[PDB]
Design a protein around this ligand. Structure first.
Ligand code: MG
Ligand code: MG
Ligand code: ZN
Ligand code: ZN
Lengths: 481, 162, 481
């Protein structure tokens, strides 16, 4: 009827199966084991072999390599590793069932119900919607029934990421500053009714004296929308929140300080800041976590025009500081100077802001880890441990006065959007944001390296990657528990 | 000189084609009352058949203002003047033939032509010098847009030349 | 006769002096205190005021701001801070005595004998030698006599850095692969007689099957010299060593994969890898530390010629692995594939290699910290704590399979010198070096961001910075104790 993804590990006496696999073997009377011998070598991690007709009801039994049984927290790679194995191995498996055009598939728990699910789902995602030529929409349910609460945690966690991936991925002619808000609000409210949304317009942002976010929007004729998310998880409402901020340039052309045509079509994902953290709240509300969280994301676009932000321009952020706007492409810095200032109104506990800010971050670490600066070692620890679990790494980066210094000397004004020199890119830019933050637990997460995937993460197909959404989710789970 | 330095230096979002004129006029009149100013608008420049200055302005949505300074220093009014002209692009982004992001924030001082000579008259009127001088400076901005000046374009200057 | 650098801090009731300062005040009968009032505001950190004729024997008494008395380990800035204050404050002071053309100066201990010395000396250094127009050569002795062992630790530590600064700084027509070795050997032997040097020539390197270092040298007509340093600190000779490796391209023009004329004259400091670690041993031997250390540094040059290394070239490193040489400017990677392989011969405990490898590192952190990758958290800790003390920061960077993967797929060969993509620069390059390392305590230190100083570090004048030499020294002190 449908396919099945089985798992196996490496040697002992004969490479052991995952118990779903062992079970299914006994069932076809050893002949899965038997054909595995006959087929070729053994399956190291992530490798895949497909055995037809072993079962009546399962034409295609794909067996995938799970690596070491006891594979675990790796001191170097900074993650759990079995999980990492399982994720690529059922991803590998599920993409084989999807190429066999099998619309539904059943999947080995593989000892970590959650991981096989985040594999099956992250693994299968595309963003098919605008091609009439699409792959089969395969349905992936668990195999078994003993462990359902964590496989659904898989499908949950993986989906909230897939959310961001479709929110980033979609062309910025479709996924606008409004349509992004429309979907989010819709996603947050279908997540829980303990939620309020505020797709605040130009008038309110004007009213908020958000000079800097506004200076940015004015290039396009597409409207600014400052978005406000709320989830009231806490039993006592009055618990002060955790506030997520996120940059939402739906399209970045650089503005007057205009980009090269070389791969500028990826700037449709310069709203990844906004998308990631939004998907995290949509997800923390599906988990319905005992915490009040607040999504804040200035959605607008960077374009050149007769009224676009010019080089040399001093503008006023909400907080009273002026900014020389020396480079119109350093604009997340300005959109974020204001929603950061607004974050403090909420009396937060943690202000995690996130953004696709600098290509320099990409030059830095580049899709390994999502670089995170933070005046909180406590906070750093927290994001990092969560990243160990989820596998979407995070690497601390420096928030040193050294860097502030460069941004702070300024011809016209109080702060400059680009620092004195070429060097230290993400640090300069994070140094600019701290000028707009007085809280003891702030975290900049520059996501410009994890904006995309090709092959680097196995279980993600090519296209917007939606990172580090699950590490953000997992952090708020653990902070709630 | 310091006048020109603040007139050049200030961001072209603040120091516009109008705000430049506002300050100058203010500075020229506080220099002497033997002065007239004319912050002539698009209609007058249109009227003047200043096709070429106009072709330039049309990129921005910020208004052109052709400025006219006067100082009547001469005892006999009818002494013909000394005339200063000065370019006043408050911001130059190159337009469609667009600049590099490398230090384009200095183009806020592409109105230095206009600023220098204007400061000179403001100054010659404080000195109250026995000469009639005339400040003339087309203030406008260069930007790219759906109606910006394109490459290949023949436009008509006042004098008949294309 | 001579000048004097006094220190003061911020308020209490009236801003306190350092006891040298207090003492010198009583001595001119309060009139230093008195004129300080008369002069202007108070002196915040690093600021400087110069009072003539307060003393008979001290025409110029410069007083410098020391910031907070109790200023200490900063959780964010990752350093001791009083030290950092004192360093810029007497540096500030000493450069005032040197502009007053006062050939000798006496200096306030400032509560940290060592720090005021590393300030006075790092602070005063230039590399005057090739101008006939030079500043006065001011002599900086301590003020006092109570704490002499640590001020000399200052002058020691600062000098070993100044060594590297002159070794980097000097034109690569003068400071060749041989003249670098000549000075080092000379500096190591005048440091202790418990030392051997080996300025091994092409024949020996040929003999060593150091195909990769050799492929690099062959562009120039200037000779390769693989250098071998030794210091036998250990009481029992047979204690296996700590081995420092260091890249020594005296000049990098990129080779056939040739650089831009824009500031290529700084590549005269692409031997900073070799210089830093060499200065560290010269220094650990002056300290005469109970450890055997081994300096290893392939000195040669990158030039274009009729016999220069070409793009596409597979060459053989000592260890048997081949390298596609796709970019002739990624050449530290090759010079280092071989001296890394040779490091294991010595049965080391720690293999710290150091190099000015990637401009990407500069894009990364950029003169804040010297990025360090290491398969040893233990080792990381060690370099980092040392950096807390010295102030020459170090930032861990990732050594993830992710990155290896990119370098490892290779058309022709076993390893490629540049990885698959533009992104993640220093990590790709460090991933290449680990392919040439099997030891449990290896550390790559990419020094490309700290190659230079302008103003970023206060107490260093503009020019080659010589970083992170004291953190390396301080690490081997602490590892010896
Ligand atoms: Mg941008
Ligand atoms: Mg090079
Ligand atoms: Zn952007
Ligand atoms: Zn090099």
């Amino acid at each position: 009827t449908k396919g099945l993804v089985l798992g196996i590990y490496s040697k002992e006496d004969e490479p052991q199966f995952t118990s779903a696999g062992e079970n299914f073997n006994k069932l076809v009377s050893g002949k899965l084991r038997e054909i595995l011998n006959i087929s070729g070598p053994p399956l190291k991690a992530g490798k895949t072999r497909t055995f037809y007709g072993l079962h009546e009801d399962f034409p295609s039994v794909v067996v995938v390599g799970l690596g070491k049984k006891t594979a675990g927290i790796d001191e170097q790679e900074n993650w759990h590793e079995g999980k990492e194995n399982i994720r690529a191995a059922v991803a590998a498996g599920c993409r084989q069932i999807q190429d066999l055009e099998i619309p539904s598939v059943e999947v080995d728990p593989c000892g970590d119900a959650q991981a096989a699910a985040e594999g099956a789902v992250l693994g299968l995602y595309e963003y098919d919607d605008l091609k009439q030529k699409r792959k089969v929409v395969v349905s992936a349910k668990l195999h078994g029934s003993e462990d359902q609460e964590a496989w659904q945690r898989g499908v949950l966690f993986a989906s909230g990421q897939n959310l961001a991936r479709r929110l980033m991925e979609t062309p910025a002619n479709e996924m606008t500053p409004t349509k992004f808000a429309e979907i989010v609000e819709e996603n947050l409210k279908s997540a829980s009714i303990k939620t309020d949304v505020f797709i605040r317009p130009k008038s309110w942002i004007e009213e908020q004296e958000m000079g800097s976010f506004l200076s940015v929007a004015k290039g396009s004729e597409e409207p600014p929308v400052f978005l406000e998310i709320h989830y009231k998880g806490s039993p006592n409402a009055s618990e002060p929140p955790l506030v997520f901020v996120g940059k939402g340039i739906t399209f970045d052309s650089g503005g007057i300080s205009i980009k090269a045509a070389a791969n500028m079509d990826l700037m449709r994902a310069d709203m990844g800041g906004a998308a990631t953290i939004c998907s995290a709240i949509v997800s923390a509300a599906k988990l319905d976590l005992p915490i009040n969280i607040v999504g804040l994301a200035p959605l607008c676009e960077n374009m050149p025009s007769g009224k676009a932000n010019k080089p040399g321009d001093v503008v006023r952020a909400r907080n009273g500081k002026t900014i020389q706007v020396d480079n119109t492409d350093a604009e997340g810095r300005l959109i974020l100077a204001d929603a950061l200032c607004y974050a403090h109104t909420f009396n937060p506990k943690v202000i995690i802001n996130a953004a696709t800010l600098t290509g320099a971050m990409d030059i830095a670490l580049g899709s390994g880890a999502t670089g995170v600066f933070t005046n909180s070692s406590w906070l750093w620890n927290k994001l990092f441990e969560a990243s160990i679990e989820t596998g979407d790494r995070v690497w601390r980066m420096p928030l040193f006065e050294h860097y502030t210094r460069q941004v702070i000397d300024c011809q016209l004004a109080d702060v400059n959007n680009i620092g004195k020199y070429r060097s230290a890119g993400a640090c300069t830019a994070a140094a600019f944001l701290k000028e707009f933050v007085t809280h003891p637990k702030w975290a900049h997460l520059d996501i410009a390296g994890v904006m995309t995937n090709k092959d680097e993460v196995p279980y993600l197909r090519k296209g917007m990657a939606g990172r580090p959404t699950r590490t953000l989710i997992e952090f708020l789970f653990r902070f709630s528990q």
